[PDB]
Predict the structure of Bacterioferritin.
Amino acid sequence: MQGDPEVIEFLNEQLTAELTAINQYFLHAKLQDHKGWTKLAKYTRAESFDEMRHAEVLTDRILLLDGLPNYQRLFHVRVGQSVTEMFQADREVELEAIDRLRRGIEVMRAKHDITSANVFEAILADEEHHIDYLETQLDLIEKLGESLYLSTVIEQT
Amino acid sequence: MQGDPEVIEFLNEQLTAELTAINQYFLHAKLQDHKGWTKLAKYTRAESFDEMRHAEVLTDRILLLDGLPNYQRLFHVRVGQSVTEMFQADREVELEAIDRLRRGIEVMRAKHDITSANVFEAILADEEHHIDYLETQLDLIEKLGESLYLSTVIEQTQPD
Amino acid sequence: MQGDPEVIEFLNEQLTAELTAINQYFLHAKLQDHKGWTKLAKYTRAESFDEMRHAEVLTDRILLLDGLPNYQRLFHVRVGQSVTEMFQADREVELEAIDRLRRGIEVMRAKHDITSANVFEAILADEEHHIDYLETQLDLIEKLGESLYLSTVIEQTQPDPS
Amino acid sequence: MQGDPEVIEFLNEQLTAELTAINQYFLHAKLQDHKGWTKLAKYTRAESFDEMRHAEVLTDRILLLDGLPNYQRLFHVRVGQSVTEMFQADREVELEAIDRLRRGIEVMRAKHDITSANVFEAILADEEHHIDYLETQLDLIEKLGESLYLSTVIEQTQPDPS
Amino acid sequence: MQGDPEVIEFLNEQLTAELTAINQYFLHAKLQDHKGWTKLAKYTRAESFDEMRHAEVLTDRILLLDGLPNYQRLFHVRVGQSVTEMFQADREVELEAIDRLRRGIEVMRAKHDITSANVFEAILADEEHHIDYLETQLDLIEKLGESLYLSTVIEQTQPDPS
Amino acid sequence: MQGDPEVIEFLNEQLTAELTAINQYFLHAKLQDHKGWTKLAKYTRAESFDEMRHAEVLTDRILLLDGLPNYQRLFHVRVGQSVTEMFQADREVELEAIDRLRRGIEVMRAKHDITSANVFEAILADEEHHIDYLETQLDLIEKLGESLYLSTVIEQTQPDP
Ligand code: HEM
Ligand code: HEM
Ligand code: HEM
Ligand SMILES: [Fe+2]
Ligand SMILES: [Fe+2]
Ligand SMILES: [Fe+2]
Ligand SMILES: [Fe+2]
Ligand SMILES: [Fe+2]
Ligand SMILES: [Fe+2]
């Protein structure tokens, strides 16, 4: 079996993108744990684990399609100091991931490929859930207050 | 099998330092528990027991080298009224402990002694972890405010 | 709710005394363990822990009275080379403790304070038991002979199995 | 507490090196598993997780010293077709890491910093063990023959129940 | 990769020393057991096994560096009739080992080699503990008297783990 | 109660031989484990422990008879590069031990001492079993080939299950 070059390019772009997502999420989790916000650190660690589960599925698929996975390059990684910056950065990265996923799903469905379309659909659903959570947390922080939101997450054990 | 007098005096000085730390930490734990800040009291108790382990291993080591540990003299022990003063006091005390530990490690390693250097290294790592915790707690209380942090640490769950 | 200064000073003196006893007992236990005598080492460790409970309850009580405990002052600490010197030193320490406890109990009960008198009574009973043990051990070693006496505490005879 | 830039840059270089090792090891594990050789895939997975722990410890230490870990820089990642190429690439990576680790521990111990030296020592021991394993495996395959060596690592079974 | 001859010869000398210690300790344990002194025999057996572990780890380390372990030559092994001679012989061999270990770790650390230095530190700590035990036992028998000391190790073991 | 010098010297030289045997066997086991042949390493370790138990019982018997065991002298220890050299060295050691054992048991039984003869018989049986195993392993290596035998004996220390 030989896949089209376009679907290989789409899969490689997704792989690179969520490798970048992995690096960003793990760094943010470490920073939050260092600052003393334990529960946020646990949630971010879980999110990173889910993300590179996605990455493993993607590389397995592209390897099955008789291609060369790309591990050398990665996109830009951004970091923030306050919680708002981290939330906004994650929002933007998963947003562009969602847009690329939709475009790739359409093209791959048109190109008589099905299984890769299904894995793209599953990834899209997971990213949608994540961005929903991020938006909820952002508006909660905006309504409540930075100090109160930080106080309700401190553990000190 | 006798050791050098300089390493013995270094060990004695560190023993006195961690004994003073023991006393200060226990007093602060009792004072915090009196006012109702339960979680801080538990953490301070645990830290006092850690400094106890420091002191016990240190006196065992100096006694092995045919020395005379002194349990007589103490350094100045300071107390605070609010949380910031006690945090600052602990920070400064094991800050100077860290400095003395580094200098002693260098001299002792240069003087052809290894095991004492190793126990000094372990103690140094522990004190570095503790001062990191103190600094992050100080930054947290500075950002949040005294009332909010105190409310976070309040338990009020006494059985009766 | 404020206590009289005399009661506070009595509590502080007793706290200092039991802290000094803590230090002396722990040092003696460590020295005996290093020498090679084990049963004496564990018994001295237990006694040090008992005096540590003494100190904890004392500081709790004085703190309840809106007082200020002091952890700076410390009495003279004495050490010995042979077993007899250690026994005599501990005997003298707890003797002084007993005398101070009796005087404080009398004054404190005379000045309308009961709970502190009760904790002093409990501490006095414990100190009396300890000094009784010290005296009987000293008589035993004097009768038996030093070498023959300490031939008993030391042992390597696989005590782990049971 | 503050750290001088030399220790920070040494730790950052080691962090990037271990990240590159993570990527290369996992890619090789996936490739070997796809080819049909299973035990090699399991061993490579374990090695990738070990380097993963290394990286986590390194970034924790960097953050403790009030530094700025970087997750952007990445070294060159190389891949191979036959088993010999993979083993040679891993051997080169480990050799470079060992040399850098030795230079770094020397420099940072000469400037009064001990804990960082200790974590460097632990990492150095682990990478030394790994390169020893790679060398002995390479000697084994060179002596035995490629096909005969591969015949002992393949297995045919359904999805393994873990 | 490959080590310089100096570290190799240091490790070989230490290996020979620990082999000689193994032989001497086991012979002393057997002789003590034959005479009826029980606990001394099992303590010496435990010491023999500890030196066995020392030799094994040293052999692994030297073999890692592409060297040739020396299992042929031995130093001088000495025996004693009474307990004092055995204790003094063990003290002598431990002192020699301690001095050689210190010189070796200094030289090895001064030439960019850390892991072997760490194994030397571990061995040094263990032998220091052993010589401390020997010294305190010698002082104890000197104070107590040979016959009275021997009377406390003859019997009364009763090992019943269950 | 003390025995004759001849039996004690026989026992002493047998003790020296067994000590040399355990040294050689342990060194060979370490070399084989380092090279990557795990199962051979396990078998060699078991054999070394067996011979070193032999040495323990022999020195116990020597001490019972009011003698002086010697732990100072040693015989020549030989090492090999490939499997064939190791097997041949072990075979030679066992052959020498068997010959000495037979001569010693005959001589010492002819002089009214049977318990030492019995321990010699037990050791003789054990060493005979060992040399039989070595011979059959050498025959297998000759029949199959150096590479095929090693491919059979190697294993991957995955430790991930
Ligand atoms: C990029 C930097 C990453 C770091 C530092 C990291 C960190 C970790 C850590 C600390 C563990 C647990 C190790 C333990 O508990 O002993 C783990 C587990 C795991 N990681 Fe990540 N992670 C990263 C991204 C990745 C990567 C690169 C992979 C590669 C496949 C991945 C997939 C997994 C999987 C499958 C597990 C096991 C989870 C399970 O068995 O349920 N994640 N990771
Ligand atoms: C000043 C020298 C001190 C020494 C040598 C010392 C020694 C010890 C040791 C070794 C333990 C055992 C802890 C464990 O096994 O986890 C212990 C427990 C304890 N310490 Fe300290 N400590 C000291 C300071 C203090 C002081 C001044 C107090 C005052 C009250 C104190 C209160 C306690 C208590 C309440 C315990 C628990 C006792 C028990 O569980 O029975 N400590 N001490
Ligand atoms: C030279 C005369 C020796 C005598 C009389 C002797 C005696 C013994 C005996 C009877 C055992 C019990 C074995 C078992 O229960 O399976 C033992 C333990 C052991 N022996 Fe020796 N042995 C000698 C030399 C050696 C040497 C040089 C080594 C080198 C490594 C060695 C390796 C071991 C090991 C690894 C153990 C077990 C230790 C453990 O499990 O942690 N033997 N010794
Ligand atoms: Fe994602
Ligand atoms: Fe401390
Ligand atoms: Fe008392
Ligand atoms: Fe690594
Ligand atoms: Fe040793
Ligand atoms: Fe044998």
In short: The pocket of fe (ii) ion (ligand 6) is lined by residues C 18, 21, 51, 54, 94, 97, 127 (CB under 6 Å). The CA atoms of residues 19 and 107 of chain C lie 23 Å apart.
